[PDB]
């Protein structure tokens, strides 16, 4: 999976 907001990334 991609990392996004919920995984602390922007």
């Amino acid at each position, epitope marked *: *999976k*991609l*990392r*996004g*907001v*919920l*995984q*602390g*990334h*922007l």
Partner: antibody
Amino acid sequence: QVTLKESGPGILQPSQTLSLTCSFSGFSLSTSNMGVVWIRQPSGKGLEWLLHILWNDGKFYNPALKSRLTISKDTYNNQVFLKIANVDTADTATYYCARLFTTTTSGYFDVWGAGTTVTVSS
Amino acid sequence: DIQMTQSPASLSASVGETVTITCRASGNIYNYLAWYQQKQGKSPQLLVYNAKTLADGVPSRFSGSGSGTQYSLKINSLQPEDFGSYFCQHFWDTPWTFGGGTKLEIKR
């Protein structure tokens, strides 16, 4: 020449506000995929993620501490400012800032500061 | 929340030995696991990211492996500089969480 250096008060009495500064060079907080993270480690114990601030001013917090946490960045002077409000004795630890490299397909702290020691007591 | 369970807490070994440290996440983390190495009294350095990608400066006798919730760090033929502490850490759902650490210590 990516470098980071924590600064702080060293000793603090309980109920006070801990102010920590991270001064960095060799990278910019105006470049994407970059962030600064704070991590702490009580002497002889494990590591704990506190929070991070990103190049685009995104901020993320440990929920256990999020109520007491504040972070900002001064991108022109290459500094990140951390505040922990109302410290108790359990906030006694070594504090690290480190560069966060973050993308949609990876994450890691590849360069850390040497750490700064913080003691909370009366 | 998403917890890292690292074992063993302590491991005695000899130079030349091959050892393996394990880390279990309480939920799928999609290979987003870093390993850090910490010398006594020092700031931790990055060894491995995305579970199996070696960081710069790191010899091939280190390898990572695993998926889902089960990950491990393996050190082939330990060398003196390898003694110290090792921590895993995930980069999936916040809060990010570190393993409790493994002390790699000298057998005698």
